[PDB]
């Protein structure tokens, strides 16, 4: 309500694309003090101010035996045991000792993707980045100066995405 101690706005996540959907004022955690006197009402307003101070600030400032993949594996290069190879004479029966070659096997097992991505955001980074945002003087500018990110039906490039096509 008050343009100085405003109820905060809480973002909504779209898991599927990784972008952040529209947000809204928090409407599930409001305190109903409509049956209180000036004392508790001032106390509650001070509490909400403290909460807003916590939010603003937070947001602004805070932004051998390799483990393999959780089960370590040993590593040997000269562990070659069966030195024979079947020439015209020999006939090698069942064999095989699985050993990770130091350079070939391990590096080929831990290479990253060929080219890094460029798109949406995962859940953890969304939680760390999109804290609830406190909007102080709501919509106080001329048309076009409003925060359009809040409306979920608004597309950044093509403005005001017409629902239903």
């Amino acid at each position: 309500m008050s343009k100085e101690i405003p109820t905060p706005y809480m973002w909504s996540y779209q898991p599927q694309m990784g972008l952040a959907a529209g947000a809204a004022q928090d409407y599930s955690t409001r305190i109903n003090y409509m049956s209180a006197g000036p004392h508790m009402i001032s106390r509650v307003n001070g509490i909400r101010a403290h909460r807003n101070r916590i939010l603003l600030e937070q947001a602004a400032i805070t932004t051998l035996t390799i483990r393999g993949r959780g089960i370590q594996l040993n590593d040997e290069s000269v562990s070659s045991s069966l030195g024979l190879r079947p020439d015209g004479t020999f006939q090698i029966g069942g064999a095989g000792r699985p050993s990770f070659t130091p350079r070939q096997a391990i590096l080929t097992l831990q290479t990253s993707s060929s080219e890094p991505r460029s798109g949406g955001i995962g859940t953890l980074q969304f939680i760390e980045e999109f804290v609830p945002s406190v909007y102080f003087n709501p919509f106080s500018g001329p048309p076009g100066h409003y925060p359009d990110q809040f409306i979920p039906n608004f597309d950044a490039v093509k403005d005001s995405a017409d629902g239903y096509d």
């Binding site: 779209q14 694309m17 039906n153 995405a161 239903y164």
Partner: peptide, 22 residues
Amino acid sequence: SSNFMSMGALTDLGQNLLYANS
């Protein structure tokens, strides 16, 4: 899809923000 064409597997209307965030 917008014009009923097969402009890809993931149709643009499928990515239309209204159908995506509501």
